Design a protein around this ligand. Structure first.
Ligand SMILES: *[C@H]1OC[C@@H](O[C@@H]2OC[C@@H](O)[C@H](O)[C@H]2O)[C@H](O)[C@H]1F
Length: 185
């Protein structure tokens, strides 16, 4: 499907060269960054969405995640389905596991303090995570059946807000360098 949304945010640290490519294709080259997130996907997230992607290039040198990435409001929640990463596997408060799309993912919560959110400025908000137990190989057509994650999260008291914001397959980085090329559909 057409992705109707382009996410390209940087806190301004270092270099984030983000290319909005043809169709659902994008690429990022980044160097010595602060926080950034770049992705393609949908203006309005859905708990029923099934995301296809193929990361033609997945080459982080440092902390970068290849991840479904989205927000809700009411309440304000930042959520992730992490399929691969760089030198740092994201973790937090272990809640359980979920099997989806051929992988086993650990379910985590964490909380961010005084940090930017989709509202801009700085707040405290909750983060919900499914994180693959080992890196998904890249270069093939992969699927993230998101309802499997939403249902598993609910079973652990992790309920998303009712106001859906954007929902993208992203490259998410913090204080690192790398290159990625991802097609989303
Ligand atoms: C989740 O990832 C990075 C950052 O998210 C951004 O916040 C600012 C907003 O305008 C963008 O749309 C977000 O991607 C957040 O602090 C972090 F915890």
């Amino acid at each position: 499907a057409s992705t109707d949304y382009w996410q390209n945010w940087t806190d301004g640290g270092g270099i984030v060269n983000a290319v909005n490519g043809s169709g659902g294709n994008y690429s990022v080259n980044w160097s010595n960054t602060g926080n950034f997130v770049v992705g393609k996907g949908w203006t309005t997230g859905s708990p029923f969405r099934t995301i296809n992607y193929n990361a033609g290039v997945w080459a982080p040198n440092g902390n970068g995640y290849l991840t479904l990435y989205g927000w809700t409001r009411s309440p304000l929640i930042e959520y992730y389905v992490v399929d691969s990463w760089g030198t740092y596997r994201p973790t937090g408060t272990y809640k359980g596991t979920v099997k989806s799309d051929g992988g086993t993912y650990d379910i985590y919560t964490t909380t961010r303090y005084n940090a930017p959110s989709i509202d801009g400025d700085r707040t405290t908000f909750t983060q919900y995570w499914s994180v693959r137990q080992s890196k998904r190989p890249t270069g093939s057509n992969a699927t993230i059946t998101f309802t499997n994650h939403v249902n598993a999260w609910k079973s652990h008291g992790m309920n998303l807000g009712s106001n859906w914001a954007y929902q993208v397959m992203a490259t998410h980085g913090y204080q690192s360098s790398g290159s990625s090329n991802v097609t989303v559909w």
